[PDB]
Design a protein around this nucleic acid. Structure first.
Lengths: 310, 133, 55, 148, 200
RNA sequence: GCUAGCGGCGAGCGACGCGGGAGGAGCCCGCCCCGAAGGCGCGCUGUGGGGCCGCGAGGGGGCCCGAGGGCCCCGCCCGAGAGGGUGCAAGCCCCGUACGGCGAGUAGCGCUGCUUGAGCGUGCAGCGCGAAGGGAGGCGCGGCCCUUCCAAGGCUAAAUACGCCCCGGGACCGAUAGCGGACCAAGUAGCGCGAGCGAACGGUGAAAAGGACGCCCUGCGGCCGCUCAAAAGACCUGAACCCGGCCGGCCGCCGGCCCGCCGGCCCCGUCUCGAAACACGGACCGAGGAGCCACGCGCCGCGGCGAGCCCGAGGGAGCCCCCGCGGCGGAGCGAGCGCGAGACGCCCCGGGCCCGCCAUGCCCCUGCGGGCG
């Protein structure tokens, strides 16, 4: 099939052949595994100090002073123990924890492809919280010569119907709950459009727009593709980027895109097909359980068991 | 976002700068929008507040016009003339209510000779910026 | 000091919990300990005609 | 990870899965594989035959590259021929032009004979050959050959 | 707990809390790549026409495990240099590394390396006699290994069965086996000859 | 690679050559030649030559509030919607942010001691002895070769390591936590003859507006109220234990019922055959307080790929993108020399047979070798 390309004013401009990456099977579990491992790689190390709790000179007073046996300082102040105030942690955090997990290139390339396949799926994109009502097609490809001005970038977003999503991010700005505020994470804004570009300076124009993230086709990021480990980011593809998507995958050397599989809808149709229905045989009639009754009292109840006697 | 990594976006580091700033930085930090008549006249949006400045506070309590009589840099607050706290008895010294410089708009300035030179220096740098920096 | 030297109580119960397991079926037919000569003859005999899997 | 772990489900249980009668104590059986010939002989005999003793001549420095001898099989010689090349070779037979496979180039030194070559003359060039390799190679019509 | 567990060959941690510091964390990895790129970029800028890497020779990888592969070596021998007619000073001044320690060990190595020098000498352009800025600016710095050594992928040739048959003895396996055991079969013969002298 | 080796060959211990990268750069003195030409008060016992600075966009109206930074309508600037402040949650109130500009007492050897994985010796060292062609090739000793180097003199960049201090950042801690130390004076107050030890203590409010005035006090101070949105009054919130006034009630738990009667009811934790135990710990209450992380091995599940498989270190004006070796698996078995798997079969088990190791016949080539059993 083909994908419609739209102009800056929202008119149809051309039709681009759909890249084969969009047919890659949609596997949410691969996206979650790669996202979890990759986000852990972007963690900074934390650890309590090596000398914490152990710079005191404390030795146990011992049995026979009616005290407990824990290390005590000169005045008998408890020390060097997890329970003690000012004691070392029982097992102190260390910077030698493995922070980064390992993902094989093949799976880290399946995750991106499946996430892109989810982007082609409007149903998944609506479920990810995007406002797609006015977007003319999903996937959306927009011709956009270098946009160096935010005002002009917004005018293209208004024409192509992505504006409601850009607004839902602007309005979302709020102060986060917790010590996140204190630790340089004060404001949370909902994430919305993603602009993938090639051979364009559209970055200067869309960067300030609230909620919009921009990436070059050559280096697409899964974390941007699936924010929250949820597949279905709204992607605005610039004509050049979407028409080069097949080249990027072709230049992934010895890589064959994961072969497409069937969907749930296609297996209900296949199950509903006459061939499967012909094989179906009608099941034998079930047992009638009923419930115990005293047959002796009722003429009718005895009659079910003893027709002659009644 | 900020591309100069040399600057800090840490709440703690930025707040320490405000709380513990050199006087020359405290003075610029205490600045107020010039009136639209003064904006046309001097072609500068904001000037650092001095002592002899007529100012209109558009704030909530104490909204009014007054001439600054005290600038308290350590508290980061200015005291206009006129705006004062309610007095418990009529026979008592009036206490000025401290107003933030950001809560007020300048209506007149103490031109001095250094202030004239400062408006000129800024006007020149703004003109270079307007010439496609 | 002194503890119990030996007890058999419960050991029969423990054995019969899932036990009294018969000894395989291969064991009843194994050629371990069989006559070396008889076994050689069996191989030569089954290495001729339909039984032979020699190809 | 930590949330989906057994020790999180052992809270309120005291001992934490280690037993009232004998709890977790530090090093109850000893530290390391100590006790192999004494207190743990039953384990080192049940599952570790050959653990204790000395069994062979000792080379002070084994030279890992003189020792290295890579091997091929008469069954995998034809997978070394590129697939497009292999089909033409198979139909032609060509005693005149049969494909010489220098196994040394592909990384192998000795040709063993695990399975069976296809019935087409081949010519295999190697440092060494087995007996049932040469027999299988020469039956197919191929010639065992030695390469410097 | 036991059952069949392969035993560990791990060594116990030494100097864990006191001592030299035997732990190397690699958080400095992303930023070491950046520092190393910058050092190369700044060194490259300092000599724009000149490539960062000097021509180095094609040398056989040592050992029988890699005999038929080639790698880059420290420098050209003085025999390889005499094939192109270049002194060690001139060669180094034009960016060809020189090793006076290396000895060729084969006629083939000299020819392979002499060929490689000829390609470089044709490729090298010397900017002399007053730096013509537009022409020195026009020059492009070569980045990465100069002429990187390529190990050709193996190919399948074609041969006559008859010519091959002349080259090998029948029962090659016997001939190979006779050669492997020759020293031992001769030592046992010499020993047996002495046991015969015992009769006399 | 972590093996080769070492080790009451026990517990343990343990390199290296390959190979892939980072980074690469070579040289000198003695000797010998000349001899004062030299660095010439010396020296022929030999000198000399061979980063700062800098501008910086764009908001109003109403409601309401102690105060918008709130709510409702409606705009504007975005190469700037990083942040900080401002009387409540601010892209447009302020600061900023993005955009800029200008070779001998030696080697070796003998004996000893330390050391190494180095094993009839890994590197050193004392002593005794002391070469001339000499060193090495992972089992000593004597011969003969071969490969490969020249010790007993010196210099040398790069890639690499790292605290104080400065700079940025964090899925870090949040005042019993985090440094011992967030408190204008923490290595302080205090303690020890000394070496040394070593605390506690954050938060009024938007603004000090830190309490008007009247009354009664001998006075202390009470009262009334004042300032404030509020006393928030020496301080935010104000718990539990414990206590006092008033105010019910008669007393623990569980069950029934209008509810004070009837019926049941030992003190938990803990080791223990067995605890209400005259076994132990526990006055009370609040906070803190104990299977985490690394690495190795076993097995299980799951994902990708499949006789293959692999973000190795690295490199790509590139760090979620691309490119990227060993390794491991694919063949085993034997102390080794070495030799080296097809015959079947859904699957499983077994038998049969093949390969190695060990024996035994028989045949024969290129023969203590090959073939067949």
């Amino acid at each position: 099939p083909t994908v419609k390309v739209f102009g800056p004013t929202g008119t149809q401009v051309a039709e681009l052949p759909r890249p084969k990456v969009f047919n890659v099977p949609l596997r949410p579990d691969i996206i979650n595994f790669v996202h979890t491992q990759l986000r852990k790689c972007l963690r900074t190390p934390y650890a309590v100090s090596r000398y914490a709790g152990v710079q005191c000179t404390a030795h146990s007073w011992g049995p026979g002073r009616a005290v407990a046996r824990l290390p005590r300082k000169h005045g008998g102040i408890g020390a060097y123990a997890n329970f003690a105030r000012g004691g070392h942690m029982a097992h102190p955090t260390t910077v030698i924890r493995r922070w980064c997990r390992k993902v094989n290139l093949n799976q880290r390339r399946y995750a991106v492809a499946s996430a892109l396949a989810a982007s082609a799926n409007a149903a998944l994109v609506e479920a990810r919280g995007h406002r797609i009502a006015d977007v003319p097609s999903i996937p959306l490809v927009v011709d956009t010569d270098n946009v160096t001005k935010t005002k002009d970038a917004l005018a293209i977003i208004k024409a192509v119907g992505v504006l409601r999503d850009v607004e839902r991010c602007k309005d979302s700005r709020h102060i986060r709950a917790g010590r996140g505020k204190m630790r340089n994470r004060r404001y949370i804004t909902r994430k919305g459009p993603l602009v993938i570009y090639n051979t364009e300076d559209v970055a200067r124009g869309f960067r300030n727009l609230p909620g919009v993230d921009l990436c070059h086709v050559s280096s697409i990021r899964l974390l941007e593709l699936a924010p929250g480990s949820h597949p279905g980011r709204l992607i605005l593809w610039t004509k050049s980027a979407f028409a080069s998507l097949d080249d990027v995958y072709a230049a992934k050397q010895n890589y064959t895109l994961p072969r497409s599989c069937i969907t749930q809808t296609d297996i209900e149709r296949i199950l509903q097909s006459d061939a499967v229905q012909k094989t179906f045989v009608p099941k034998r009639d079930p047992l009638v359980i009923e419930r115990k009754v005293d047959p002796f009292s009722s003429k009718e109840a005895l009659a079910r068991l003893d027709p002659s006697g009644t | 976002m900020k591309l100069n990594s040399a600057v800090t976006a840490s709440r703690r580091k930025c707040r320490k700068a405000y709380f513990t700033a050199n006087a020359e930085t405290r003075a610029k930090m205490m600045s107020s929008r010039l009136s639209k008549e003064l904006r046309a006249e001097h072609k500068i949006k904001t000037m650092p507040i001095r002592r002899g400045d007529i100012v209109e506070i558009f704030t909530g309590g104490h909204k009014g016009t007054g001439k600054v009589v005290e600038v308290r840099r350590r508290d980061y607050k200015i005291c206009v003339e006129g705006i004062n706290q309610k007095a418990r008895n009529p026979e008592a010294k009036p206490v000025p209510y401290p107003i933030h410089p950001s809560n007020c708009i300048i209506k007149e300035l103490y031109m001095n000779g250094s202030r004239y030179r400062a408006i000129k220096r800024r006007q020149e740098r703004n003109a270079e910026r307007l010439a496609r920096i | 000091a002194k503890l119990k030297n030996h007890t058999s109580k419960n050991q029969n119960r423990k054995d019969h919990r899932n036990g009294i397991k018969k000894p395989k079926k291969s064991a009843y037919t194994s050629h371990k300990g069989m006559c070396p000569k008889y076994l050689r003859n069996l191989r030569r005999s089954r290495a001729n005609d339909p039984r032979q899997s020699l190809r | 990870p930590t949330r989906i772990r057994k020790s999180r489900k052992r809270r309120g249980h005291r001992q934490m899965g280690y037993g009232r009668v004998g709890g977790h104590r530090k090093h109850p059986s000893g530290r390391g594989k100590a006790g192999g010939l004494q207190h743990k002989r039953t384990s080192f005999d049940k599952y570790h035959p050959g653990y204790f003793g000395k069994l062979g001549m000792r080379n002070y420095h084994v030279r890992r590259n003189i020792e290295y001898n890579p091997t091929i099989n008469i069954d995998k010689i034809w997978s070394l021929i590129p697939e497009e090349q292999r089909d033409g070779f198979l139909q032609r037979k060509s005693t005149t032009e049969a494909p010489v496979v220098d196994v040394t180039r592909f990384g192998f030194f000795k040709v063993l004979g695990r399975g069976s070559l296809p019935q087409c003359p081949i010519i295999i060039k190697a440092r060494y050959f087995s007996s049932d390799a040469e027999k299988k190679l020469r039956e197919v019509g191929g010639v065992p050959l030695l390469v410097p | 707990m036991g059952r069949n567990v392969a035993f560990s060959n791990m060594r116990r941690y030494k100097c864990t809390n006191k001592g030299p510091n035997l732990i190397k964390n690699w958080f400095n990895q992303p930023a070491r790549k950046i520092r190393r790129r910058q050092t190369r970029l700044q060194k490259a800028k300092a000599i724009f026409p000149c490539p960062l890497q000097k021509l180095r020779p094609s040398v056989t990888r040592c050992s029988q495990k890699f005999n038929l592969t080639q790698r880059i070596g420290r420098g050209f021998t003085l025999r390889e240099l005499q094939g192109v007619g270049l002194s060690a000073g001139k060669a180094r001044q034009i960016g060809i590394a020189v090793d006076p320690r290396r000895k060729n060990k084969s006629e083939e190595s000299v020819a392979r390396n002499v060929a490689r020098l000829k390609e470089y000498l044709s490729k090298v352009t010397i900017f002399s006699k007053q730096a013509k800025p537009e022409e020195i600016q026009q020059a492009i710095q070569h980045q990465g290994v100069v002429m990187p050594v390529v190990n050709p992928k193996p190919v399948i040739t074609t041969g006559s069965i008859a010519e091959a048959k002349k080259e090998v003895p029948e029962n090659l396996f016997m001939y190979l086996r006779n050669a492997r055991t020759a020293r031992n079969r001769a030592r046992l013969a010499k020993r047996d000859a002495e046991r015969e002298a015992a009769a006399k």
